[PDB]
Amino acid sequence: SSVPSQKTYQGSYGFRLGFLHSGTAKSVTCTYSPALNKMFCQLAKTCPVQLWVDSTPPPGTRVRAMAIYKQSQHMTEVVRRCPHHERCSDSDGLAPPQHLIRVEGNLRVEYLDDRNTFRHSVVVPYEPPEVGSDCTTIHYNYMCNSSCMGGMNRRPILTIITLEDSSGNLLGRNSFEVRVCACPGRDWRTEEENLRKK
Amino acid sequence: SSVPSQKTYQGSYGFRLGFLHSGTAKSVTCTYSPALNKMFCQLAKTCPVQLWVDSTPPPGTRVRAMAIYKQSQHMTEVVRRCPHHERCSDSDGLAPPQHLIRVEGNLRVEYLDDRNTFRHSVVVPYEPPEVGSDCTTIHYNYMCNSSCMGGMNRRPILTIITLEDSSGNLLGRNSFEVRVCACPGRDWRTEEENLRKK
Amino acid sequence: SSVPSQKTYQGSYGFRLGFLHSGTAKSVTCTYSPALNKMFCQLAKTCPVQLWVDSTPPPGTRVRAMAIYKQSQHMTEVVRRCPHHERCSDSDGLAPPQHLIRVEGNLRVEYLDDRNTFRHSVVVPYEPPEVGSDCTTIHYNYMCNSSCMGGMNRRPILTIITLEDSSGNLLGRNSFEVRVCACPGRDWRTEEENLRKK
Amino acid sequence: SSVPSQKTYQGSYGFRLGFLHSGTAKSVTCTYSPALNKMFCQLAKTCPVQLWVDSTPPPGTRVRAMAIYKQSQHMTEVVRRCPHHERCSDSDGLAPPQHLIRVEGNLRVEYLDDRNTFRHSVVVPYEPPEVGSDCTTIHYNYMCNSSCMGGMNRRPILTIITLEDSSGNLLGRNSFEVRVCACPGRDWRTEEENLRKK
DNA sequence: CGAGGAACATGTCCCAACATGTTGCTCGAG
DNA sequence: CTCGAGCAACATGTTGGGACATGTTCCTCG
Ligand SMILES: [As]
Ligand SMILES: [As]
Ligand SMILES: [As]
Ligand SMILES: [As]
Ligand SMILES: [Zn+2]
Ligand SMILES: [Zn+2]
Ligand SMILES: [Zn+2]
Ligand SMILES: [Zn+2]
């Protein structure tokens, strides 16, 4: 009631998410772990998420992205950037400095603040795949480390991506855990390799 | 001269309770012992209780939660927080500081005080399971240790969850014993392991 | 918030403190450890402190007793009783319920609350030793355990006894650490025996 | 482009600094390394510095304390608390939240902010040693870790203590390096033991 | 150069140990 | 036949510090 749904819902347009499978290096900047359904992303580093749909949705549909804290203790608290990072000037003009999740290189972006929950989100209108493509990509990037004292303060978060009509109705939903850190490469291996033993 | 009924009553909507109980660690924060029908919960730690129903109940139905002391000597006394804990500021805004049981992350919550019995309770309107889910979860948390001098003072309590219509009528009821303590992990094992011998 | 001096000062009247050396039992209620200069006292149990003086001081001299927290972190905070204990009715009429240190069986006692510091103290006029005695005794007792959640909260305290003239001047000062606990006997041995090793 | 002098100057009153030599434990909160002339202090932990003087200075003399960054690159920058720590409410009323160095339990304290340099300091009037004592102690505590992102940001600092007359003149000066950290014990040993090898 | 990957620096966490109040269990009295 | 005083045993919250977590620096090498 106070905490956005995290439930996967492919909807009637077959809304699914994809990620660029890389990892053949060690000095990696952004990577995805299908086992953990978790993305390992460096701070303020562009990372493509791609949208897949069986059918094309009607014009006026938008995709919003919103972080929530994963653990139940913290769910209720709003995910914002840390005092340090909001005050240091790194904006791209458009993005309010307090917002964690911004969208790179999309002029029709809007940064929003729900009047009831107070959560931040970032919405962009849906575009269908370009000709000769199977998916639309959004380039998000996250503007704090997970360990930022005063912000996420070492707590893991989820990123929920919804597909919504003009009127704000839900057409589909997906989610994935995110860890923003200095060494995605290292943190990637450690977590997957810790999983094998257990 | 009135203690609420503690009797299990699944009612005509098949009201039952479920718990995660996942554990598998030692540093556990919340766990459930089916053998003891008891929950072991840390102080102010979110712990999911989930509601199961054969049929969906009519709109306007609400679920209330209320603590009573388990032992017969004490049943009659009202379960409230200790002097220390009511006066220390830890409220979430909504929850009156004297109330033991609060509900995390539900905006339509109400904290009540029965004009006849004087017992506290916390009610939230019933929501059916989200699509592709079998149960509705509530996230309670308990705001004093069981051993709190001046409150429960080392006396065990029960938590009674009822399902009620708008008008206050009973549609179903369940209950489980609760121990709020610093070390749920330890206290869990001890009690189960003490049970085997006897 | 400035802190009363803790400095020993025997002054020009040779103000010293004495205690009844007992300990030949295990079920002890009040005992003194010269090594630690610490008293081990049960809650609300009368314990004699005795005053020794080389010279007799002028009429109108008073002795006040005041607790402060020992550690430097906490010195600044005023020592009061816990929420449980102030609200439970155990007063002897004279003693305000918030005051930690009271004096047994002295009708001319006064309980003071400094309008600037807010510290409590308990003053009684000085009487010289009775004929054929070498010291005057005061019977203090402490109205909370050291471990009282919401009060001293496991922090050790000092008790400062000053000898003051009518005009408020300092004539002498002494101090001793106090631990109020359920088992003085046990807590006595443990601390002395732990001192040897270190 | 004006950095306060760091030069030791014992002056005509023989102004020197002393520290409580402890360290017989591992879980240490505040310690001093004579070799390094450095103090290892936990965050917001009271730590005594003591003033020694051959002769007593005239009434109206004050002692001020001021942090500056040690390295030459950074000297020029003002030492303040981090964005997280200034905004979190932990004040004792008197201390402005941005000030790094505060003084515990002295009511005549003043927090100063130089209209030209913008440096912070904390001044308290000098008191001579209490009777039967060889030094006056001040209880400082530092309100950020050395590693605080957005504040000192892992850069070491110096603490300069001056002895000044009413009129603002210099009567004496001393200094010592400070590291505020979570584990003073560990960080103490590491640095002394690293010194041997080099 | 700097890209890469150690090693380093630095704050947290886990849980056995410890601390501390309470409830048995035992055995010599009124 | 009990009954209570005094310890052992238990109950329960807190601590201590080695192992982790996590960002930053710093040598090695195409
Ligand atoms: As990414
Ligand atoms: As729970
Ligand atoms: As005593
Ligand atoms: As210190
Ligand atoms: Zn940040
Ligand atoms: Zn409580
Ligand atoms: Zn108390
Ligand atoms: Zn800081």
Identify whether the C-beta of residue B30 lies closer than 8 Å to the C-beta of residue B184: yes
**Cα-trace Rg, chain A:** 16
Identify whether the C-beta of residue C188 lies closer than 8 Å to the C-beta of residue C23: yes
Whole-number Å distance between alpha carbons of D28 and D44 = 14
Whole-number Å distance between alpha carbons of D95 and D111 = 7
- How many inter-chain contacts (A to B, CB under 8 Å) are there? 32
DSSP H or E run through B194: helix B184-197
Query: Burial level of D90, CB count in 10 A (0-12/13-18/19+)?
Result: exposed
User: What distance in angstroms lies between residue A73's CA and the mean position of ligand 2's atoms?
Assistant: 11
Quick one: residue B7, left, alpha or beta (phi over 0 = left, psi -120 to 50 = alpha)?
beta
Q: What is the DSSP letter of C170?
A: E
Whole-number Å distance between alpha carbons of D122 and D66 = 7
Cβ distance A88 to D150 less than 8 Å, yes or no, reads yes
Identify whether the C-beta of residue D66 lies closer than 8 Å to the C-beta of residue D175: no
3-state helix/strand/coil string of chain A:
CCCCCCCCECCCCCCEEEECCCCCCCCCCEEEECCCCEEEECCCCCEEEEEECCCCCCCCCEEEEEEEECCCCCCCCCCCCCHHHHHCCCCCCCCCCCCCEEECCCCCCEEEECCCCCCEEEEEECCCCCCCCCCEEEEEEECCCCCCCCCCCCCCEEEEEEEECCCCCEEEEEEEEEEECCCHHHHHHHHHHHHHHC
Which tokens is C13 given?
């009247």
Nearest CA-CA partner of A27 in A146, A194, A186: A186
Which tokens is C194 given?
């732990």
Least CB–CB distance from C3: residue in D92, D105, D131: D105
Measured at the alpha carbon of residue A80, what is the angle toward residues B30 and D43, in degrees to the nearest 5?
75
CB crowding D27-63: b at 16 or more within 10 Å, else e:
ebbbbbbeeeebbbbbebbbbbbbbbbeeebeeebbb
Neighbouring-strand partners of residue B69: B157
Whole-number Å distance between alpha carbons of B146 and B144 = 6
Which tokens is C7 given?
């400095």
Q: What is the DSSP letter of B155?
A: -
Nearest CA-CA partner of B163 in B194, B136, B184: B136
Query: Burial level of B102, CB count in 10 A (0-12/13-18/19+)?
Result: buried
Which tokens is B35 given?
């053998």
Whole-number Å distance between alpha carbons of C46 and C43 = 9
Whole-number Å distance between alpha carbons of A41 and D125 = 53
User: Strand D170-180 vs strand D38-41: parallel, antiparallel, or unpaired?
Assistant: parallel
Give the residue with minimal CA–C1' separation from F16.
Answer: D27
Distance A153 CA to F23 C1' (A): 14
How distant is the Cα of C134 from the closest Cα of chain D, in angstroms?
27
Which tokens is D91 given?
């004040």
Sheet holding B110-113, edge to edge: B30-33, B38-41, B170-180, B157-164, B62-69, B120-125, B110-113
CB crowding B2-30: b at 16 or more within 10 Å, else e:
eebeeeeebbebebbbebeeebeeeebbb
Whole-number Å distance between alpha carbons of B165 and B160 = 16
Q: Is the sign of the CA dihedral B91, B97, B100, B101 positive or negative? A: negative
C25 touches strand F (CB under 7 A): yes
Cβ distance D104 to C8 less than 8 Å, yes or no, reads no
CA-nearest residue, atom 1 of ligand 3: C47
Whether B85 has a binding-site annotation, put simply, is yes
Binning chain B into helix, strand and coil, the percentages to the nearest 5 are 10, 35, 55
Phi, psi of D147 (to 5 degrees): -90, 10
Identify whether the C-beta of residue B87 lies closer than 8 Å to the C-beta of residue C80: no
Identify whether the C-beta of residue C36 lies closer than 8 Å to the C-beta of residue C190: no
Identify whether the C-beta of residue A112 lies closer than 8 Å to the C-beta of residue A164: no
Mutate to test the interface with A, among D85, D87, D149 (most CBs of A within 10 A): D149
What is the distance in angstroms between the CA of the first residue and the CA of the last residue of chain A? 34
Which tokens is C5 given?
């001096």
User: What distance in angstroms lies between residue D9's CA and the mean position of ligand 4's atoms?
Assistant: 23
Mutate to test the interface with C, among B143, B149, B152, B154 (most CBs of C within 10 A): B149
**Cα–Cα distances in angstroms (integers) from residue D157 to residues D2, D71, D75, D137, in the given order:** 16, 8, 9, 22
Q: Is the sign of the CA dihedral C143, C145, C150, C156 positive or negative? A: positive
**Cα-trace Rg, chain C:** 16
Q: Is the CB of D30 under 6 A from ligand 4?
A: yes
Beta strand residue intervals within chain C, DSSP E: 16-19, 30-33, 38-41, 47-52, 62-69, 101-103, 110-113, 120-125, 136-142, 157-164, 170-180
Mutate to test the interface with C, among D27, D41, D90, D131 (most CBs of C within 10 A): D131
**Cα-trace Rg, chain B:** 16
Nearest CA-CA partner of D30 in C128, A110, C72, A178: C72
DSSP H or E run through B165: none
Residues 6+ apart with CB under 8 A from C97: C81, C85, C86, C87, C89, C90, C91
Total residues belonging to chain C: 198
Q: Is the CB of B41 under 6 A from ligand 2?
A: yes
Measured at the alpha carbon of residue C99, what is the angle toward residues D140 and C184, in degrees to the nearest 5?
85
Whether A41 has a binding-site annotation, put simply, is no
Collapsing DSSP to helix, strand or coil, C125 comes out as strand
Place of tokens 């001269």: B1
Residue C32 structural domain: 1-198
Phi, psi of A154 (to 5 degrees): 70, 5
D26 touches strand F (CB under 7 A): yes
How distant is the Cα of B148 from the closest Cα of chain C, in angstroms?
9
Place of tokens 């440096």: D119
Whole-number Å distance between alpha carbons of B162 and B147 = 26
How was this one solved? X-ray
Whole-number Å distance between alpha carbons of C126 and B60 = 73
3-state helix/strand/coil string of chain D:
CCCCCCCCECCCCCCEEEECCCCCCCCCCEEEECCCCEEEECCCCCEEEEEECCCCCCCCCEEEEEEEECCCCCCCCCCCCCHHHHHCCCCCCCCCCCCCEEECCCCCCEEEECCCCCCEEEEEECCCCCCCCCCEEEEEEECCCCCCCCCCCCCCEEEEEEEECCCCCEEEEEEEEEEECCCHHHHHHHHHHHHHHC
How distant is the Cα of B82 from the closest Cα of chain C, in angstroms?
8
Residues 6-65 of B with CB under 8 A from C: none
Residue of D nearest to A87 (CA): D83
**Cα-trace Rg, chain D:** 16
Total structural domains within chain B: 1
Residues 131-160 of C with CB under 8 A from B: 148-150
**Cα–Cα distances in angstroms (integers) from residue A90 to residues A98, C187, D86, in the given order:** 11, 59, 21
How distant is the Cα of A44 from the closest Cα of chain D, in angstroms?
17
Identify whether the C-beta of residue A43 lies closer than 8 Å to the C-beta of residue A105: no
- C-alpha B3: how far from chain center: 16
Whole-number Å distance between alpha carbons of C113 and C99 = 9
User: What distance in angstroms lies between residue A143's CA and the mean position of ligand 5's atoms?
Assistant: 7
Identify whether the C-beta of residue C139 lies closer than 8 Å to the C-beta of residue C19: no
Chains near A with 3+ CB pairs less than 8 A apart are: B, D
**Cα–Cα distances in angstroms (integers) from residue D104 to residues A160, C28, C47, D175, in the given order:** 47, 38, 33, 19
Resolution reading in Å: 2.9
Residue of C nearest to D95 (CA): C1
Identify whether the C-beta of residue A176 lies closer than 8 Å to the C-beta of residue A158: yes
In chain A, what's the furthest Cα-to-Cα distance? 48
CA-nearest residue, atom 1 of ligand 4: D47
Collapsing DSSP to helix, strand or coil, B185 comes out as helix
Query: Burial level of A105, CB count in 10 A (0-12/13-18/19+)?
Result: exposed
Cβ contact D–A (≥3 pairs, < 8 Å)? yes
Q: Is the CB of C138 under 6 A from ligand 3?
A: no
- How many inter-chain contacts (A to D, CB under 8 Å) are there? 25
Whole-number Å distance between alpha carbons of A112 and A118 = 9
User: Strand D62-69 vs strand D157-164: parallel, antiparallel, or unpaired?
Assistant: antiparallel
Q: What is the DSSP letter of C60?
A: T
C154 touches strand F (CB under 7 A): yes
Whole-number Å distance between alpha carbons of B102 and B66 = 10
Which tokens is C32 given?
């003194």
Residue of D nearest to C71 (CA): D46
Collapsing DSSP to helix, strand or coil, B79 comes out as coil
D150 touches strand F (CB under 7 A): no
Q: What is the DSSP letter of B16?
A: E
Whole-number Å distance between alpha carbons of C173 and C49 = 14
- C-alpha B115: how far from chain center: 21
